[PDB]
Write a protein that binds this ligand. Structure first.
Ligand SMILES: N[C@@H]1[C@@H](O)[C@H](O[C@@H]2O[C@H](CO)[C@@H](O[C@@H]3O[C@H](CO)[C@@H](O)[C@H](O)[C@H]3N)[C@H](O)[C@H]2N)[C@@H](CO)O[C@H]1O
Length: 132
């Protein structure tokens, strides 16, 4: 059960209309979030809507994937998280599907914080799935 499905999202940026964060959590492999281009970090987070115990994230990257990124959680109250905790990071991402597991943790928000690009574009996810 994908706890991210159709939850509210926010992003650091978007490439164009139609590439919003909601596109990464629609369960559709043919729609994607895509960030602005360039060498800045970028990110997408999901408001899970309630505290959930999570242990697994599945990323389905488009060709503009991150070689370096972290998965982070927040347990802030409200709808605007500001404190993040890294639960997993890599510097050797290889794109396509990334199936990530980590110690189960409470989380109200989950963020992909992407820091090194595989390409000279931005970063883009067809899907960002979250599992207990
Ligand atoms: N100089 C143009 C060249 O830019 C163009 O190639 C296309 O450029 C597209 C716009 O950057 C690029 O689309 C991005 O692709 C990445 C990676 O797949 C995605 O994450 C972005 O969302 C896309 N906007 C295309 O890949 C690329 N074909 C070419 C064709 O118009 O004309 C060149 O000479």
């Amino acid at each position: 059960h994908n706890l991210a499905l159709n939850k509210a999202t926010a992003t650091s940026s978007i490439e164009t209309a139609g590439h919003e964060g909601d596109k990464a959590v629609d369960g559709n492999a043919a729609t994607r979030w895509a960030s602005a281009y360039g060498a800045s970090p970028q990110w997408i987070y999901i408001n899970l809507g309630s505290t959930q115990s999570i242990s697994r994230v599945k990323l389905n990257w488009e060709d503009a994937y991150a070689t370096a990124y972290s998965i982070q959680v927040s347990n802030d109250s409200g709808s605007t998280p500001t404190n993040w905790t890294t639960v997993y990071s890599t510097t050797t991402g290889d794109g396509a599907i990334d199936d990530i597991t980590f110690a189960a943790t409470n989380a109200k928000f989950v963020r992909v914080y992407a820091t090194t690009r595989a390409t000279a574009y931005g970063y883009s996810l067809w899907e960002f799935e979250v599992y207990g």
